[PDB]
């Protein structure tokens, strides 16, 4: 429950309906329901999953943003006192956010990454976990901020490990791997250095080896490259 | 103007 | 309850936070509770109430229209039996797009259009009346249908008599109410027509009227005057 | 391409 009563192909289906109509929140609980059926997810429902809750996060993340400046201009030389009305709702956001956070990094200790033996489902979901102690660190500024940020290094690390191993410079879970992880030594670990010379090395590496592809892996190792290299443009 | 990540 | 421990200072003031963080679900939430205050709402206020529920229930309208496309073709000769999960997912849909009009509809008769006596604040809530409606017609299939059609019917045409007899021709409230009960005939009422008359009617009224408003009023009356234009340019 | 309403 509330899925638990919903088959696992219906909840996959339905999961796929919810996209189309961009009913993330309704897709994120569709794959919640289908990945505590206790089964593997595949390729595809594993995009499903990551897809349904950068979504829903990411609308939570961009309206926090929106509240925390409203906030930080309050709070400056000559604002005018407004009450806590401010303070509230971007509590209230931040609240739920960290709740869905705390939902993913539920499902993928209860159980996906202990069952996910394939480098492809193993970097796909500690790249996952990287990036939601990523969010929960962009809102952070307790006891536990060094903590969070820690479990994001971790997560990431161990998927860049594996990825490099494993998979080939051009996987585009490597590159979006990369791309994050670059991002979060950039703005959360504030080591600016560190996420240049990520983007760089990660970018310089696979288009070496796009050769090696097909016209149609070509297209899409690109695609997560041009991020990389919008970043480097941003960041340099 | 923002940061991409994916 | 939920808002009723929260002032209603402050449910106004968290609804244009809201509106800025484009989270309208919350903002629909606060102003429901400052209706529930009890007092009348101003006009910036009216706006807020209609802006939040106007995109809610847009957002589900959408969704449902993607998904009762689907079901359409899966209803097709040749189309493979896919099972009932496009019929119920497009329910579930349809169920909460209910739910939000019947919310909204509440409000509106307790109590805002009961004490709701001057005429800006009078047509504005029976045009809402009139779309809440219009959005249960387009999902209606039952024995119901008619009833409904007849109640948004209902709710414009006492709108525009009070609008005709005491806001200019130019008035956007005026002007949105005739756009919208003009849609509600060519789509609901299957009156093309009728909907046409209407707004080229409305829209040359508004012509002729225009040499009457400041450069300001001049801007916000074209606004809607465009979208007249518009549906007749679609229709035409 | 679709009618518009406010
Ligand atoms: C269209 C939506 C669905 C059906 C959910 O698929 C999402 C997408 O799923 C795949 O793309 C993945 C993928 C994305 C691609 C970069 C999108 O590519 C294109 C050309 O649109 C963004 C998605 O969020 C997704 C699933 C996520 C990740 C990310 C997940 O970290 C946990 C790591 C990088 C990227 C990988 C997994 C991509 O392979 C596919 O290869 C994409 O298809 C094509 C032709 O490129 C498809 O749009
Ligand atoms: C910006 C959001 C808030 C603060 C909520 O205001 C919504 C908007 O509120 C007013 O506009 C109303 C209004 C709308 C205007 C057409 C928007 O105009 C511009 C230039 O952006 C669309 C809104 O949904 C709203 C509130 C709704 C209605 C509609 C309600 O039926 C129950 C009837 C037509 C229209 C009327 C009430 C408009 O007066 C204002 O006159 C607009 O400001 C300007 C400069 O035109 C402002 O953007
Ligand atoms: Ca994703
Ligand atoms: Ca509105
Ligand atoms: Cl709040
Ligand atoms: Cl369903
Ligand atoms: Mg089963
Ligand atoms: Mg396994
Ligand atoms: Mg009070
Ligand atoms: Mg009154």
């Given at each position: 429950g509330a899925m638990g009563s919903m088959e696992r192909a219906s909840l996959i289906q339905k999961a796929k309906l919810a996209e189309q109509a961009?009913?993330?929140?309704?897709?994120?609980?569709?794959?919640?329901?289908?990945?505590?059926?206790?089964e593997e997810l595949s390729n595809e429902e594993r995009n499903l999953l990551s897809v349904a809750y950068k979504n829903v996060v990411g609308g939570q993340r961009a309206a926090w943003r929106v509240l925390s400046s409203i906030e930080q201009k309050?709070?400056?030389?000559?604002?005018?006192?407004?009450?806590?009305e401010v303070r509230e709702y971007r509590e209230k956001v931040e609240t739920e956010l960290?709740?869905?956070?705390?939902?993913?990094?539920?499902?993928l200790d209860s159980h996906l990454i202990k069952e996910a033996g394939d480098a492809e489902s193993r970097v796909f979901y500690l790249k996952m976990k990287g990036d939601y102690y990523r969010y929960l660190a962009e809102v952070?500024?307790?006891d536990d901020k060094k903590?969070?940020?820690?479990?994001?290094?971790?997560?990431?690390?161990?998927?860049?490990?594996?990825?490099?191993?494993?998979?080939?410079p051009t996987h585009p879970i490597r590159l979006g791997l990369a791309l994050n992880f670059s991002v979060f030594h950039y703005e959360i670990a504030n080591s600016p250095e560190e996420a240049i010379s990520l983007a760089k090395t990660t970018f310089d590496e696979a288009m070496a080896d796009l050769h090696t592809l097909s016209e149609d892996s070509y297209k899409d190792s690109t695609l997560i490259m041009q991020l990389l290299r919008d970043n480097l443009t941003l960041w340099t | 103007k923002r940061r991409k990540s994916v």
């Open positions: 961009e009913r993330y929140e309704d897709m994120a609980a569709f794959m919640k329901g289908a990945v505590e059926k206790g309050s709070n400056e030389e000559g604002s005018e006192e407004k009450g806590p960290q709740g869905v956070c705390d939902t993913v990094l539920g499902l952070a500024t307790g903590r969070i940020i820690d479990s994001a290094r971790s997560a990431y690390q161990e998927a860049m490990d594996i990825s490099k191993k494993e998979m080939p | -």
